[PDB]
């Protein structure tokens, strides 16, 4: 019922047992057809789907570009968690073709490696220490 | 929509800080002149079928990597209303799809989204979309996602 790997993994393995091919239906923003709800053999919820953290700075960049346009230097200092396989190479290009008069720059701080081993209190410490260095004497605006 | 333009940088260059997924330093937070909440950002509807395709690949990769196998015959068909992709991911999703193992019997079927307007029937829009969705699904078992 929730959309997550263990749920999806189990379903995949009993779907191969019926023989039938499987179609997965994703409707529009407002939802699916009613004749889709009636035709479903089963349903999953997509409410566990959250914005992946690497895309947060992407959206922030876009939103600043979009607020600059409603018409000195604006510096986005972000931890650069590895971006999704599908997205990367596509942001670097999107940034390269930002308007040459928008005073913007993306400054990415390498991410400390998180793991079952790592205390994140001390990963956050290094990241912030370098972020504050990069921000210098500028006006400081946190986004959290 | 973007009335943030009220931001009135005058004097100093402005530094906007985005921490990791777990948040910002004590020093960062202690140094903040302003803070701004950062989750009505919500993730765009076009990216749902991106994430679903990523999820499916991942689920497929783990399950068929079992010490016991032979998936053989069952195709998966992702049938998705194709709302316009954001620019920043324009054809990285296309390139992403070329990298799926051809082992994986996967197909993505994008159904043309109807133009949503300043006044758009919506009732009509989704019902047309459903019929193209079901028609593309044929006799497959139907699993709905939302």
What does this molecule look like?
The structure is a homodimer. With 144 residues, chain A is α+β, with helices and mostly antiparallel strands. The first copy, chain A, folds into 2 domains: 1-50, no CATH class; 51-144, no CATH class. Chain A is 38% helix and 17% strand. Chain A contains 5 helices and 5 strands. Chain A has helices spanning 5-15, 34-39, 54-68, 90-96, 120-135, and strands at residues 22-26, 42-44, 74-79, 104-109, 139-143. Chain A has a two-stranded parallel sheet with strand order 3-4. In chain A, strand 3, helix 4 (90-96) and strand 4 (104-109) form a beta-alpha-beta unit. The longest helix of chain A has 16 residues, at 120-135. The two termini of chain A are 31 Å apart.
